[PDB]
Coordinates of C-alpha atoms in Angstrom, one line a residue:
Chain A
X1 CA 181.5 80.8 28.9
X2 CA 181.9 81.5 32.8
X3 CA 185.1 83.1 32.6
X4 CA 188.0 84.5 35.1
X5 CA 189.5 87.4 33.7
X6 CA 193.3 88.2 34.5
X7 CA 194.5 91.7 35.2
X8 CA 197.5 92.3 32.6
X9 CA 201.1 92.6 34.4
X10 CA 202.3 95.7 32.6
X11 CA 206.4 96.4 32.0
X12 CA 208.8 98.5 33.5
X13 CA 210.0 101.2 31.8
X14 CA 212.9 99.8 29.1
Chain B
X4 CA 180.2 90.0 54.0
X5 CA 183.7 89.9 53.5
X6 CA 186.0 88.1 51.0
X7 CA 188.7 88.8 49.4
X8 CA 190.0 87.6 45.6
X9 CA 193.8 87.4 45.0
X10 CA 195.3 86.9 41.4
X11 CA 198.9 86.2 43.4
X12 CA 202.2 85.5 40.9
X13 CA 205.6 84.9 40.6
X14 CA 208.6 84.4 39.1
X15 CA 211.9 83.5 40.4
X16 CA 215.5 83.7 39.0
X17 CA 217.7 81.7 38.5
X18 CA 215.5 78.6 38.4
X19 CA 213.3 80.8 36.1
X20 CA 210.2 79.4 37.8
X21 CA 207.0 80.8 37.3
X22 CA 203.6 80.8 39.1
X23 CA 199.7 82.0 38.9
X24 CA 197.2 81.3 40.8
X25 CA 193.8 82.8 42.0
X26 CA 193.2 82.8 46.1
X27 CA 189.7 82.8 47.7
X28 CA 190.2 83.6 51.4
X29 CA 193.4 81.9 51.7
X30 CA 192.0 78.6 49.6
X31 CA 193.5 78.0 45.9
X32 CA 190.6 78.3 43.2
X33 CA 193.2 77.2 40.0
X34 CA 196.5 77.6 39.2
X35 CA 198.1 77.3 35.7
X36 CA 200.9 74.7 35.3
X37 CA 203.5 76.0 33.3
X38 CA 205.1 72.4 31.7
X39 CA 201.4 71.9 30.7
X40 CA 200.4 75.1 29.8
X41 CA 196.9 74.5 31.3
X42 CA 194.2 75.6 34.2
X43 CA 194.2 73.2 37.1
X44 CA 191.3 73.7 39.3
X45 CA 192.1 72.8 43.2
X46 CA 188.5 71.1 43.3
X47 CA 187.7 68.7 40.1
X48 CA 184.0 70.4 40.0
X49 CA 185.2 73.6 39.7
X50 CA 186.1 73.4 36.1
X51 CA 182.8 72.3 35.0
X52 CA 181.5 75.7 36.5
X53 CA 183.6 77.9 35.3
X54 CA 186.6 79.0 32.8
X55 CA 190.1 80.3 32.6
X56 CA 192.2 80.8 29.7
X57 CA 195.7 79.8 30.4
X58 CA 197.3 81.7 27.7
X59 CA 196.5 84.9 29.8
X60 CA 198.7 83.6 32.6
X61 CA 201.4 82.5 30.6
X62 CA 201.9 86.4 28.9
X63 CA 201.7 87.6 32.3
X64 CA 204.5 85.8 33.8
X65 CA 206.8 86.6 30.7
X66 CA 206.1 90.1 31.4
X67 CA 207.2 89.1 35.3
X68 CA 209.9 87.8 34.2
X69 CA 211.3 90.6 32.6
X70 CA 210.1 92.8 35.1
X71 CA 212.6 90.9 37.9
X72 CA 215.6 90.8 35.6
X73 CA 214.9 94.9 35.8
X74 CA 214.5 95.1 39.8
X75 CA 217.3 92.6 39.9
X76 CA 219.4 95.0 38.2
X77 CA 217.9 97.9 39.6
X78 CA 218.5 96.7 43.5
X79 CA 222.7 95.9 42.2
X80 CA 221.9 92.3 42.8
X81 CA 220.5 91.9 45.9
X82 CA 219.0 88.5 46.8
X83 CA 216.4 87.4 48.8
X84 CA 217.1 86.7 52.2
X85 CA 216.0 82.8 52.7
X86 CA 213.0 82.4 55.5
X87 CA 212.7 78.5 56.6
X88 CA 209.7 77.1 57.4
X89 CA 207.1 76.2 59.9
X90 CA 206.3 72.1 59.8
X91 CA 203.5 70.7 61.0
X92 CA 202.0 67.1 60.4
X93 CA 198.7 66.4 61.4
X94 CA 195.3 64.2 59.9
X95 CA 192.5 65.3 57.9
X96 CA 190.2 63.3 60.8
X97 CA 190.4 61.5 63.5
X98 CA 192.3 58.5 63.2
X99 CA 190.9 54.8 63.7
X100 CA 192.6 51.9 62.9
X101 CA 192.1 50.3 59.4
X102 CA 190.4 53.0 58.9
X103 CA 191.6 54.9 55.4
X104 CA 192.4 58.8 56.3
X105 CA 194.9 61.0 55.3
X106 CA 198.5 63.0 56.4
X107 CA 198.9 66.7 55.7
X108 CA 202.4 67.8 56.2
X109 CA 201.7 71.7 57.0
X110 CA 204.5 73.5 55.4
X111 CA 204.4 77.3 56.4
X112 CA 206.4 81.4 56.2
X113 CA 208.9 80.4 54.0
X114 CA 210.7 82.0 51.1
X115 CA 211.3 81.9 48.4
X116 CA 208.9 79.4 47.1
X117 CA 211.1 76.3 46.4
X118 CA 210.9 73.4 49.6
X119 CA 211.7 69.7 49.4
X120 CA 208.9 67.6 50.8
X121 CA 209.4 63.2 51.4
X122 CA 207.2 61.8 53.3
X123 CA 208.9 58.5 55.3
X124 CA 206.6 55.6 56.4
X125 CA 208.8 53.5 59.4
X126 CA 211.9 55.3 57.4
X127 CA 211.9 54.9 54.1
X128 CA 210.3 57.0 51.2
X129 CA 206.8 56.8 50.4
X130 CA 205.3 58.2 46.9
X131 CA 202.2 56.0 46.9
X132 CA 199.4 58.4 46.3
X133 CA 201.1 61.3 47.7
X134 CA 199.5 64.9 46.5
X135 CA 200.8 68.1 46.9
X136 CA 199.4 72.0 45.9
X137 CA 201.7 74.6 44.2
X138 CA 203.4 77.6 47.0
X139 CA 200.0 79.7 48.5
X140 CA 200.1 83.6 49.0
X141 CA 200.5 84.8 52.7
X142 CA 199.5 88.9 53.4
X143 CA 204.0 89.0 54.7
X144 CA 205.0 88.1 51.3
X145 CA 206.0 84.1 52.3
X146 CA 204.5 81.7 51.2
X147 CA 202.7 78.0 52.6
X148 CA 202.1 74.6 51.0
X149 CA 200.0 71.4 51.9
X150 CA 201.3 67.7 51.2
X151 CA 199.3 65.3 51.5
X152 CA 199.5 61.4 52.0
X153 CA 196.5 58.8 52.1
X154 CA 197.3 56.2 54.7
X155 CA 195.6 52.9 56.5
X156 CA 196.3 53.4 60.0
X157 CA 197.9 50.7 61.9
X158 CA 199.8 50.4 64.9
X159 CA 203.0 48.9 62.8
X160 CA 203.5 51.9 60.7
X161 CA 204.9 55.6 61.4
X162 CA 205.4 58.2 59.2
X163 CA 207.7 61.5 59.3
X164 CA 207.0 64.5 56.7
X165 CA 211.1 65.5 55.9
X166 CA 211.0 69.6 54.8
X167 CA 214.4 70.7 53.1
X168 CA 215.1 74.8 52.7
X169 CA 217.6 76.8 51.8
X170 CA 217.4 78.5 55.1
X171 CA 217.3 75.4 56.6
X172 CA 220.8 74.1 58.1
X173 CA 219.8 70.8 58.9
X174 CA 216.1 69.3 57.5
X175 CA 213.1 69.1 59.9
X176 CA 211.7 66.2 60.2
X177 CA 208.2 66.0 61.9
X178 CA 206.9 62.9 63.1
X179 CA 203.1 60.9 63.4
X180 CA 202.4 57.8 64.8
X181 CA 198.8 56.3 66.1
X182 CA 197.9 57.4 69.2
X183 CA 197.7 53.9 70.5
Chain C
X1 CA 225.6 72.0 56.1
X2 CA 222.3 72.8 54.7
X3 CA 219.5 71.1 54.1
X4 CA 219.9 71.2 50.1
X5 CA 222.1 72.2 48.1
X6 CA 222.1 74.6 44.4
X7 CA 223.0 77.7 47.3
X8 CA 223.0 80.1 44.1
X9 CA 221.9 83.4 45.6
X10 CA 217.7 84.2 44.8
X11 CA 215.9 86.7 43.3
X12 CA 212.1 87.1 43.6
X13 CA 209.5 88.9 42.0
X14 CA 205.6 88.9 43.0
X15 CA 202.5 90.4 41.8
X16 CA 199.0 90.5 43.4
X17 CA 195.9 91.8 42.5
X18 CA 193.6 91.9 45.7
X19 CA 189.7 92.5 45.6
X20 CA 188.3 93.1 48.5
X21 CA 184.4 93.0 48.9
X22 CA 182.1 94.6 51.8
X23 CA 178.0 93.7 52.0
X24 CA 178.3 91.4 49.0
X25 CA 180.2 93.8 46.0
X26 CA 178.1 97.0 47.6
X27 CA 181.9 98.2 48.0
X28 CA 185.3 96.8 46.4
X29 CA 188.5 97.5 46.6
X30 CA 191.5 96.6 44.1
X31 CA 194.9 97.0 45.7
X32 CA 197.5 95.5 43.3
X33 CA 201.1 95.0 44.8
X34 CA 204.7 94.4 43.5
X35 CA 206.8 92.8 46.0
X36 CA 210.5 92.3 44.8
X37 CA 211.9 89.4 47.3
X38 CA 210.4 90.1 50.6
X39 CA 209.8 94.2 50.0
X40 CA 206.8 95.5 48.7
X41 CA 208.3 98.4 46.2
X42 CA 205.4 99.7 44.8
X43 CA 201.1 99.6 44.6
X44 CA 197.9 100.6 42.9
X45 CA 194.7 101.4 45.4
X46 CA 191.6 102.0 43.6
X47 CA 190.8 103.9 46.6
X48 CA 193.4 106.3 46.3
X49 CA 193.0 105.9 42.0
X50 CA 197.2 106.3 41.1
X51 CA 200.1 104.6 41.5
X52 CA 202.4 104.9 44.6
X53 CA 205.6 104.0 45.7
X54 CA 206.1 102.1 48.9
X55 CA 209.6 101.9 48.9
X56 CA 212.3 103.9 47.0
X57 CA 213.0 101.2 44.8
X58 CA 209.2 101.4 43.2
X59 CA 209.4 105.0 42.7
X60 CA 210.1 105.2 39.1
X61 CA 207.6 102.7 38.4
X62 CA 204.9 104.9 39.8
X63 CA 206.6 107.8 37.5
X64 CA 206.5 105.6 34.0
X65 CA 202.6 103.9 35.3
X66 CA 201.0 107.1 36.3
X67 CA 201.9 109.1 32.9
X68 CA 200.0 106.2 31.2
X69 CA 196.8 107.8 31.1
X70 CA 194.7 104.5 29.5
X71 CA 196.7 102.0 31.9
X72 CA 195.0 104.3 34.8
X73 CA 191.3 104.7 33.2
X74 CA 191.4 100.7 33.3
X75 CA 192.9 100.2 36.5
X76 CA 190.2 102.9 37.5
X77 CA 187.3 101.0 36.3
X78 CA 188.7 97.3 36.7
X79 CA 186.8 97.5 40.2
X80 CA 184.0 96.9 37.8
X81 CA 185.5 94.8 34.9
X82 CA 188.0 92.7 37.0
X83 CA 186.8 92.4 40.3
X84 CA 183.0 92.2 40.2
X85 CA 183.4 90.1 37.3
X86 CA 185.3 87.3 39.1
X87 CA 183.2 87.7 42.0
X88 CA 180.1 86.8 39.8
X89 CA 182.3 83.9 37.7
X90 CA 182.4 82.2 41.5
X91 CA 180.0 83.4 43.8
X92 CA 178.1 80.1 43.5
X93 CA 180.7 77.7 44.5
X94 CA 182.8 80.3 46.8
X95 CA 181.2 82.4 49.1
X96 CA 177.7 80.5 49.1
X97 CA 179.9 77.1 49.8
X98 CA 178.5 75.2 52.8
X99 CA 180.0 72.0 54.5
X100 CA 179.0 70.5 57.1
X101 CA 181.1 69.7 60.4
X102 CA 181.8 66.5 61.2
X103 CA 181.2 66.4 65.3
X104 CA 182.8 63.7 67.5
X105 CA 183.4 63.2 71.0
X106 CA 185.8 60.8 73.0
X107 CA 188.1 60.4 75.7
X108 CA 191.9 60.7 75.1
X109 CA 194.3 58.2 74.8
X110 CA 196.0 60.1 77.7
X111 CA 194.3 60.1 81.1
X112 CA 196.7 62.3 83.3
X113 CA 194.4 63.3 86.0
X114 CA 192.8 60.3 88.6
X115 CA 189.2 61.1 88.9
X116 CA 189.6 63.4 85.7
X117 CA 188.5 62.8 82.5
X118 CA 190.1 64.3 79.2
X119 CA 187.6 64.5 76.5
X120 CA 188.3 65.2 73.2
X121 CA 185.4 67.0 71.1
X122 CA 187.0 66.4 67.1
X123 CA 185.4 69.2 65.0
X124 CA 186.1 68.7 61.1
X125 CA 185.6 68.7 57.3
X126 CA 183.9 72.3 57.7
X127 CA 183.6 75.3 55.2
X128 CA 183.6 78.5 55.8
X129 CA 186.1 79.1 58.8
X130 CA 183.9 80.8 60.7
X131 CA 183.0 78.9 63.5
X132 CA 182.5 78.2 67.8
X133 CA 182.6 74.6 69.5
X134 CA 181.9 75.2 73.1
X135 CA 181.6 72.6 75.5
X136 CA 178.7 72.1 78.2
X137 CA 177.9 70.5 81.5
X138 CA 173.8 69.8 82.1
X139 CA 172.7 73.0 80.8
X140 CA 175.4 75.3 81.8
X141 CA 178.7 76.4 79.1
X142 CA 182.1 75.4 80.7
X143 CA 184.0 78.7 80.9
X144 CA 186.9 76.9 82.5
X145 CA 189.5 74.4 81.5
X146 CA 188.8 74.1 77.9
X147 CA 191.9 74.5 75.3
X148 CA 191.3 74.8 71.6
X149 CA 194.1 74.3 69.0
X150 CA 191.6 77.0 67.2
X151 CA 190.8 77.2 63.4
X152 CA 193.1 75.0 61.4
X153 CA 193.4 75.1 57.6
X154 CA 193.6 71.9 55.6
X155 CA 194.2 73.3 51.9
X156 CA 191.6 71.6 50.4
X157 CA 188.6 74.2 50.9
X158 CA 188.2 72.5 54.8
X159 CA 188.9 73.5 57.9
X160 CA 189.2 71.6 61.1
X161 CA 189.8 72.4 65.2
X162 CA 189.6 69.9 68.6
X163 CA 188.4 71.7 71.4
X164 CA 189.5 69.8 75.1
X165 CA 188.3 69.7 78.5
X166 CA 189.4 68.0 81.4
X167 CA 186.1 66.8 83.5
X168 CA 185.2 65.4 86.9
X169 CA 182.6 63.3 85.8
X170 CA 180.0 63.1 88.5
X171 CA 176.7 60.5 88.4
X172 CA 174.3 62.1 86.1
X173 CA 176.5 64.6 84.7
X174 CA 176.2 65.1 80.6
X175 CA 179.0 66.6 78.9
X176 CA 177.7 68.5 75.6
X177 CA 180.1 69.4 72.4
X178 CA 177.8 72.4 70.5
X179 CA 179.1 73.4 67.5
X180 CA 177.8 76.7 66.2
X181 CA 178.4 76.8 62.2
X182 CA 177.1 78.5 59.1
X183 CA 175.9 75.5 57.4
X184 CA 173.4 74.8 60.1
X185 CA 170.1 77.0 61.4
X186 CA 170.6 74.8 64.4
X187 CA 174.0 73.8 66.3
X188 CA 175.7 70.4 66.2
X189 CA 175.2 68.6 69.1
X190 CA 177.7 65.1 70.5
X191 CA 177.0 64.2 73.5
X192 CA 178.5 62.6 76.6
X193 CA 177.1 60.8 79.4
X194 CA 179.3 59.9 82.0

């Protein structure tokens, strides 16, 4: 398929 | 050549309201609706030429979700200072008479992205075929949004697009009638 | 007092991931930003190829991101991965998108001038935003008296503008609207003839 790909959000330090 | 591609999100607190959406020079490509849980392209052809997996959005705005709850704590609670709008109301073409054309009530540098939008037609609320896009990235951090209204023009009919904000004290109200 | 009510205070949190492109994807640039309510706190430039803090508030998220040494390799290399990658899903449909103006000319409703003549040239339905509508008289471009509400965005993938100019139409005098656009080797022409 012709696909967008998303950068990942990543989370803050717990 | 010069373009720029923006994967802009959000996620706001506490109306726990989340957005993605992917910008192409300032015009939306798709954005994921989040009751749905699907792509929505911003042009119908787009999605037969190309993909998006919603599923990708939807972990990336749990993950912004979280991360606010930690800057809201992290700030001691401070809250976004509200930034009203700019209203304008103008066609998609020049109007003639009996001649179908459409309303776009121009709702700009606001935050944050929650606005109440009714269109009026001589007064009185109109929802017949009315469209609207979700809030659109601006390079300050605020945000814009287009509502739209298909409409036979006639001399007997005027319309006002009605924007409510919290920064607003009073609503705007922005008016259109034919240029007769 | 206020125009809605639910006055609960707000708290806001954005994320973008900007590509940038120069001479097609010859050079890119990925700049993502955190912006917590109106402040950016915090941002990764491929340019610069680490996490930095904009404000004080983002400073220990550059700390925790920039010890993660696989999050940087693919922030390093999503130039290639991410941004080219999009830029290819679209280029089609995106930047080789070409529409058309729609060009016309007439006089406006309002006349405020005796012996002047307002004309209206009504420029529209266009994509890119790129664009010049210039008015004429005979052969020569009118430097004087025009007003342009300049490039306006409809949110629909078209732009449109109206370009004004106040005239003291003469015998034999032809009023040209030229449009110059990328979706035409040739400009758009309306014509009038007073």
């Amino acid at each position: 398929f012709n696909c967008y790909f998303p950068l990942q959000s990543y989370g803050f330090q717990p | 050549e010069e373009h720029v591609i923006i994967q802009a999100e959000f996620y706001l607190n506490p109306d726990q309201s989340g957005e993605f959406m992917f910008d192409f020079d300032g015009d939306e490509i798709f954005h994921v609706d989040m009751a749905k849980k699907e792509t929505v392209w911003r042009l119908e052809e787009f999605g037969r030429f190309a993909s998006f997996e919603a599923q990708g959005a939807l972990a990336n705005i749990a993950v912004d979700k979280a991360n606010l709850e930690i800057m809201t704590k992290r700030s001691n609670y401070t809250p976004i200072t509200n930034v009203p709008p700019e209203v304008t109301v103008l066609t998609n073409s020049p109007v003639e008479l009996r001649e179908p054309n459409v309303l776009i009530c121009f709702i700009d540098k606001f935050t944050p992205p929650v606005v109440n939008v009714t269109w009026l037609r001589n007064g009185k609320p109109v929802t017949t075929g009315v469209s609207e896009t979700v809030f659109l990235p601006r390079e300050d951090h605020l945000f814009r949004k287009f509502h739209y209204l298909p409409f036979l023009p006639s001399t007997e009919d005027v319309y006002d697009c009605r924007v409510e904000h919290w920064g607003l004290d009073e609503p705007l109200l922005k008016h259109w009638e034919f240029d007769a | 007092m206020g125009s809605m009510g639910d006055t609960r205070p707000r708290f806001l949190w954005q994320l973008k991931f900007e590509c940038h492109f120069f001479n097609g994807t010859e050079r890119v640039r990925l700049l993502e930003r955190c912006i917590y309510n109106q402040e950016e706190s915090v941002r990764f430039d491929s340019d610069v190829g680490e996490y930095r803090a904009v404000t004080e508030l983002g400073r220990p998220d550059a700390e925790y991101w920039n010890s993660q040494k696989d999050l940087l390799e693919q922030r390093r290399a999503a130039v290639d991965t991410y941004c080219r990658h999009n830029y290819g899903v679209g280029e089609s449909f995106t930047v080789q998108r070409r529409v058309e103006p729609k060009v016309t000319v007439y006089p406006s409703k309002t006349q405020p001038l005796q012996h002047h003549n307002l004309l209206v040239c009504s420029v529209s339905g266009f994509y890119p935003g790129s664009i010049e509508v210039r008015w004429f008289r005979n052969g020569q471009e009118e430097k004087a008296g025009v007003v342009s509400t300049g490039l306006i965005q409809n949110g629909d993938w078209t732009f449109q503008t109206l370009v004004m100019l106040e005239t003291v139409p003469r015998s034999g005098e032809v009023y040209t609207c030229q449009v110059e656009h990328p979706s035409v080797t040739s400009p758009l022409t309306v014509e009038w003839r007073a």
